[PDB]
Amino acid sequence: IVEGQDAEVGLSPWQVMLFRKSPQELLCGASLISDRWVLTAAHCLLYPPWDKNFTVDDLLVRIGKHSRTRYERKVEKISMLDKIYIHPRYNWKENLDRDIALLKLKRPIELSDYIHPVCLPDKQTAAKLLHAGFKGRVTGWGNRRETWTT
Amino acid sequence: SVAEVQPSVLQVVNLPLVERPVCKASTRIRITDNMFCAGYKPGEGKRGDACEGDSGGPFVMKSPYNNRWYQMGIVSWGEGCDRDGKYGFYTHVFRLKKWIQKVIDRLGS
């Protein structure tokens, strides 16, 4: 995030972290929309142009975190994936159209103060809130600036 | 652990929904009804954007109707981070909602 600020703990309880089993590394963010399903972008998994194709056994999902680095023993849950579904019409060659994927957890996560699902919009919520000018929020552990660096 | 450029903790930014014709005009890329753009316009002074590593994260809104958070988007792509005249592109969740319910309601819904 550019020009963001530190979140309060429990600020975004649906914030999931996508992590590589090996080599160990942070891949992307994603969200918990259920006790069992995580939503993320297809390109976080499948992107041929960069020779990127992750399968279920290459990843873990870390839920309940604040710190990017340390293993937050008390609060965070670590899970493995059952299944993986990428939109059949996902387009990586022209515009990244339908950049969406669903992640099915091995077994349902245990909810808490720090782990709660966000809601998915209905028709009416969509009509009332999707208006030029209205603000929404973004969270992540992404870079604080444009890369010329690490 | 950390080091500048990479946060040590979760970051937050609130950004406005930009009108479609503006988004469409800000890029040479082929925009679709399946994505929306958000971010501050140059004539606004406030800044902020998603950046490399934010991909897959949520773009949420809080309903003033019922006080719940809704996920409206997913960080997709952009052209650099926080560049004047450019916007961040997000997957349009409500529009891909049918597919979401198809796969969760076991390939039927």
């Binding site: 022209e94 | 040479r28 590593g53 991909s55 960080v75 052209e79």
Partner: peptide, 10 residues
């Protein structure tokens, strides 16, 4: 080509 035209995956 998304790439040829400047597009960056995040």
């Amino acid at each position: 080509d998304f790439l040829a035209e400047g597009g960056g995956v995040r």
